[PDB]
């Protein structure tokens, strides 16, 4: 793919999210750099509207699979870069077990040399005293697999996976993700064999930052097809 060539170096990242969860409006900005050669993203996110009304961990998966490292033997399965620079639409529904759901729609595309991820999120049916609106989730790192499958009908991909969010009481809040991606442009894309993306994450705070924020260092690798 021609899009693959746009990711061989370090790429500036810009993220914008407008959210509404049970009527609580908020916005998030992010910035960083991606180095897909190494599957790496270095990111910092800020809540631009004050305090986030949901836990940072619940937004991590919403807040750029184009930065995954595909091993050479799997490069024909990288839909995400093949859709660049025109980009793709990424939609999810995230079902939180015994709580509400998030519906997200994002456009991921280049604006010049910057990879931009613009997101709208709507959350409904959340429990005002639950683990999400009650802020009862551990601020720790999310790591694991996103299962990718071709969606030939939509000239794109679907993904599915469950995030296990640690709760402050030792329990787990399951977040069941259903994902659809469709190219924005009408140029040809790569439709993959089944595989997954493996994410390793380190989450931190900026000790000099007074705004509500999250710092992430992410490594994402495609896998599941043998050498």
Residue numbers in the entry: 2 to 64, 68 to 231
Give verbatim lines from the article.
In the case of the monoclinic (C2) crystal form there are four molecules inside the unit cell, and one molecule is in the asymmetric unit (chain A). For simplicity, we refer to chain A of the NowGFP structure in the monoclinic form as Mono. In the monoclinic (C2) crystal form, the crystal contacts are categorized into three types, denoted as contacts I, II and III. Contact I is between molecules 1 and 4 (or 2 and 3), which has the largest contact area for Mono. Phe99, Tyr182, Gln157 and Lys156 from two molecules contact each other without any water molecule in between. Moreover, protein crystals are highly hydrated, with those with lower solvent content typically having better diffraction quality. However, solvent-content estimation reveals that the orthorhombic crystal has less solvent (∼50%) yet results in a lower resolution (1.7 Å) compared with the monoclinic crystal, which contains more solvent (∼58%) but diffracts to a higher resolution (1.45 Å). In the case of the Orth(A) and Mono structures, the key residue Lys61 has ∼80% k1 conformation and ∼20% k2 conformation under a high-pH condition (pH 9.0). This shifts to ∼50% k1 conformation and ∼50% k2 conformation as the pH decreases to 6.0, and finally to ∼20% k1 conformation and ∼80% k2 conformation under an acidic pH condition (pH 4.8). Even though the high-resolution structure of NowGFP shows a partial trans conformation of the chromophore at pH 4.8, this is difficult to observe in our moderate-resolution structure (1.45 Å).
Recently, a fluorescent protein based on an anionic tryptophan (Trp) was developed and was named WasCFP. WasCFP was further improved to enhance its stability across a broad range of pH levels and temperatures, incorporating 13 additional mutations. This improved variant, which exhibits strong green fluorescence under physiological conditions, has been named NowGFP. Spectrally, NowGFP exhibits green fluorescence (λex/λem = 493/502 nm) at physiological and higher pH levels, contrasting with cyan fluorescence (λex/λem = 429/475 nm) under acidic conditions (pH < 6).
